[PDB]
């Protein structure tokens, strides 16, 4: 019902139901909630990541009071970016997506703000 039952669901997806997820896919998994660690913290992580460690890491590092804090930047929050200019930042930086990019904007809806995106992503999760 809570986050505990939702975290387990998210592991079986990124691991593709694997017991031991690959380091790179584990980072996709943490980010999907609103978890980003410091350069040092990201080295403190174990060699082989498993479900048991993932769920401990989930409790500690996930934001509960405001699930997506990392999206808020208040110079970037209040400001309105056009749909085309927003995709410009996205297409150059992108490390994941291909055509699921059009589907992210649909999850939000011309001029958008970060507090709108975070609010909609809180309902997505």
């Amino acid at each position: 019902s809570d986050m505990e039952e939702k975290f387990r669901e998210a592991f079986i997806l990124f691991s593709s139901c694997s017991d031991h997820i690959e380091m790179y896919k584990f980072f996709e998994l943490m980010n999907s909630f609103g978890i980003i660690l410091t350069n040092d913290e990201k080295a403190a992580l174990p060699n082989d990541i498993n479900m048991d460690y993932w769920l401990n890491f989930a409790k500690k590092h996930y934001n509960y009071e405001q699930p997506f804090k990392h999206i808020n930047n208040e110079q970037n929050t209040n400001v309105q970016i056009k749909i085309d200019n927003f995709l410009g930042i996205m297409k150059a930086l992108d490390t994941r997506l291909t055509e699921s990019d059009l589907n992210i904007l649909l999850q939000i809806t011309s001029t958008l703000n970060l507090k709108t995106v975070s609010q909609k992503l809180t309902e997505s999760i």
């Binding site: 970016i81 490390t95 992503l121």
Partner: protein
């Protein structure tokens, strides 16, 4: 040891620039002012020394100064010399205190030589001279090239803290490729054995390293495995360099913003055709020939019938061994590299079957006979007949059809075809031109096989160019091979001088910044005496070849009278009829014009081309892929020199369209020894790479030349509210970005269409950009994953009713048991 003609050039290039102020306000010498001087017996008794550090004696002489030798230590004898031979020297300055040469107080010839002397010998080969970067050949691995260093320059924030290196350049080149989205190019410049090929590999290894491990390295695998094959097939041992590149390498690479090569295109040009057939003494043929006749397995030694390295006519039997090179261990690495290039064991076997065939055909001895009526008509030896028959079956060709085009003279006039017989010397040429074409087409077939797997579909958009050419090479005897190499070097220089000086001078002036002129020496005259169409050494060669009644001797005469003036062309003092000199950027180089027309013409006949195209083997057919079968007189587009210049010309414009980066490699000695400084050889290279000339570019002040648009793409994240602000104009946008980030009125400057900024405040904006980049690198990565998450979720949601049947049937099964 350095030759007198090298000394000749080295002596002439020195010149007195700035007057010596080694005198106190009253009228007596200071507390021992030290000055560099060319006068001392230590300089006379040794070539490697051109200048000694001398201290002015506490005595006097203001008109004809008194000195004593300090570095190197001398007799301590006070000798007097003229002030025209006195150059200002920095004493308090430490050579390892700073990276940029332009930071010295006195930038005279010896002061720069010493600053580089103390950097090389303390094992700090890389020294900047922005935009240029000087890399002196250490001849020993300093470990500064290893993965640890790659990762440093990669993940280190401040560029200011990092010391000069090939990676400083590799990162700043990739910083603009993604920063502004402009294609960039890296250019390794320098003479034969300066370190071009090795530096290319280091910068390639840098781009190979990725921050995030989530990339398809399958393409990046073939890209890196190609290089030790390209050096086995294209590089050979010379007296100048033991890993001398006899081919010109050019790459185009799409690299990720974190690291790693997505796609590439290795385009190799001009392979030294003569190196396959004949090699000079102490000089060796292509590494792969020796590697295959040493490291081949017992199965290939019997199937191909391989003999010893000495037993081949196309291989110098005395030069067979190279110091510090194990052709067996290299071969092991070469075979695995071929596998990594997606070549099957069948494809690799055929590659070496052709090589075995080439080697075997060379050993076959053609002899004179009283045939055709005109006599001397060639014939394949009775004992060497089986040798020839085995070779043709090794290259997968008809042994009777290859024999016919080499022994029978086929000449067609108008309509009526005429049959004859080729002479002894003529058939030896046909045998040689066949081996040359088989090797060159095979070498280029591997390039095509590589490009077939590594090339991006829909070409390149924003790629990274890299140019590894054959550096200036001078031997006792220089020919057309040496002529084409030195032309490449002069060409790379003309475009360097243009971009770095001529264009920058006009840019600052047109923008309304600096009206001041840039002083530099260009090769404009010497490049025209070789490459200007109609009036050049290359154009007169083509005219002699296309002309039926034209000789090698007639060519020299054709140049000597036409290219008489401008000085750059000087015909030889000894045997002027067959020899000539060119006043290169590295000094005078004499070429023996013997076989110049024959070498320029050497490109396999259409008669033998059809035999290799009709082959029952697929690889042997694919060598002459879409090749124009030509018969009769050689066309202007078929001539090697003409085909070379046009290939070079096209390549240069491709580089002119991008944003180049220059690496200037220096070969410190000919003896090939580490921590050995030879002032003459280095000084010539300080001129030929325009290192001393690159100092004038300090006058510009500003180290950022980009349009309002280019500034707004790379920098907008500082404040997106005033950057996206449609109402305010772009000229006013760029200035407001610098207002929020905070800048003094001295760091920035308006500009007509460009935005000029000194390096002084450049990193201050770049770090302020990074403070807003990191908070958005994660912000991008969180939203990007939150959707990537729901992609799997929505795809699973549609499969839920199908799973509800698996589980209901499982519950059913649990009831039965």
């Amino acid at each position: 040891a350095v030759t007198n003609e090298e000394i000749k050039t080295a002596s002439k290039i020195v010149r007195r620039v700035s007057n010596v102020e080694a005198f106190d306000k009253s009228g007596s010498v200071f507390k021992g002012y030290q000055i560099w001087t060319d006068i001392s017996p230590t300089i006379e008794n040794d070539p490697n020394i051109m200048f000694v550090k001398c201290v002015v004696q506490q005595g006097s002489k203001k008109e004809k100064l008194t000195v004593v030798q300090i570095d190197p230590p001398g007799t301590g004898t006070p000798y007097d010399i003229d002030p025209t031979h006195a150059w200002n020297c920095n004493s308090q300055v430490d050579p390892m205190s700073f990276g940029d040469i332009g930071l010295l107080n006195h930038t005279n010839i010896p002061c720069v030589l010493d600053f580089l002397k103390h950097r090389y010998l303390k094992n700090q080969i890389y020294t900047t001279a922005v935009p240029l970067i000087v890399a002196i050949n250490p001849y020993k691995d300093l470990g500064n090239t290893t993965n640890e260093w790659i990762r440093r320059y990669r993940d280190t924030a401040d560029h200011t803290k990092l010391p000069p290196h090939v990676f400083t350049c590799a990162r700043e080149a990739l910083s603009n490729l993604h920063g502004v989205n402009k294609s960039q190019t890296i250019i390794v410049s320098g003479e034969s054995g300066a370190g071009k090929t090795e530096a290319t590999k280091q910068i390639m290894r840098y781009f190979a390293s990725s921050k995030s491990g989530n990339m398809d390295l399958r393409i990046q695998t073939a890209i890196m495995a190609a290089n030790p094959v390209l050096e086995a097939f294209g590089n050979a041992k010379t007296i100048r360099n033991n890993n001398s590149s006899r081919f010109g390498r050019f790459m185009q690479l799409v690299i990720s913003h974190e690291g790693g090569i997505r796609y590439g295109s290795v385009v190799a040009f001009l392979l030294e055709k003569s190196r396959i057939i004949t090699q000079d003494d102490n000089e060796r043929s292509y590494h792969i020939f020796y590697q295959f006749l040493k490291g081949a397995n017992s199965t290939m030694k019997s199937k191909f019938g391989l003999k010893g390295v000495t037993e081949y006519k196309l291989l110098n039997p005395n030069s067979t061994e190279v110091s510090g090179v194990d052709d067996v261990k290299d071969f092991e690495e070469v075979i695995e590299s071929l596998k990594n290039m997606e070549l099957s064991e069948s494809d690799i076997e055929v590659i070496f079957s052709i090589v075995a065939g080439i080697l075997t055909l060379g050993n076959v001895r053609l002899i004179e006979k009283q045939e055709a009526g005109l006599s001397d008509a060639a014939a394949i030896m009775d004992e060497d007949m089986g040798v020839f028959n085995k070779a043709c079956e090794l290259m997968y060709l008809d042994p009777e059809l290859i024999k016919r085009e080499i022994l029978i003279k086929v000449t067609v006039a108008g309509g009526t075809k005429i049959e004859g017989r080729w002479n002894k010397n003529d058939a030896e040429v046909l045998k040689s031109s066949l081996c040359k074409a088989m090797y060159e087409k095979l070498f280029l077939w591997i390039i095509r096989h590589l490009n077939s797997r590594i090339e991006p579909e829909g070409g390149f958009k924003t790629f990274m160019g890299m140019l590894d050419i054959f550096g200036f090479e001078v031997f006792k005897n220089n020919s057309l091979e040496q002529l084409f190499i030195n032309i490449t070097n002069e060409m790379l220089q003309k475009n360097f001088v243009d971009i770095v000086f001529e264009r920058e001078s006009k840019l600052y002036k047109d923008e309304g910044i600096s009206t001041a002129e840039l002083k530099y020496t260009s090769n404009k005259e010497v490049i025209n005496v070789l490459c200007e169409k109609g009036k050049s050494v290359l154009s007169y060669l083509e005219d002699q070849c296309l002309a039926p009644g034209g000789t090698d001797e007639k060519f020299v005469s054709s140049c000597a009278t036409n290219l008489k003036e401008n000085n750059k062309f000087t015909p030889a003092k000894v045997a002027s009829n067959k020899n000539f000199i060119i006043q290169h950027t590295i000094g005078p180089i004499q070429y023996c014009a013997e076989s110049f027309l024959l070498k320029n013409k050497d490109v396999l006949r259409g008669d033998l081309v059809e035999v290799i195209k009709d082959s029952p083997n697929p690889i042997v057919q694919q060598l002459f892929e879409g090749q124009v079968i030509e018969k009769g007189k050689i066309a202007k587009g078929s001539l090697i020199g003409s085909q070379f210049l046009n290939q070079l010309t096209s390549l240069m414009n491709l580089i002119n369209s991008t944003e180049p980066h220059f690496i200037r490699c220096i070969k410190p000695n000919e003896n090939k020894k580490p921590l050995e400084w030879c002032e003459p050889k280095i000084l010539i290279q300080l001129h030929a790479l325009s290192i001393l000339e690159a100092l004038v570019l300090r006058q510009l002040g500003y180290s950022y030349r980009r349009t309002f648009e280019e500034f707004l793409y790379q920098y907008k994240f500082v404040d997106i509210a005033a950057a996206e602000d449609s109402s305010v104009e772009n000229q006013n946008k760029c200035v407001n970005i610098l207002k929020l980030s905070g800048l003094s009125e001295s760091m920035y400057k308006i500009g007509k269409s460009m935005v000029f900024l000194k390096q002084e405040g450049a990193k201050i904006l770049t770090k302020i950009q990074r403070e807003k980049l990191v908070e958005w690198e994660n912000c991008v990565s969180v939203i990007e994953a939150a959707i990537l998450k729901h992609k799997y979720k929505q795809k699973v949601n549609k499969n839920i009713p199908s799973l509800l049947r698996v589980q209901a049937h499982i519950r059913k099964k649990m009831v039965a048991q």
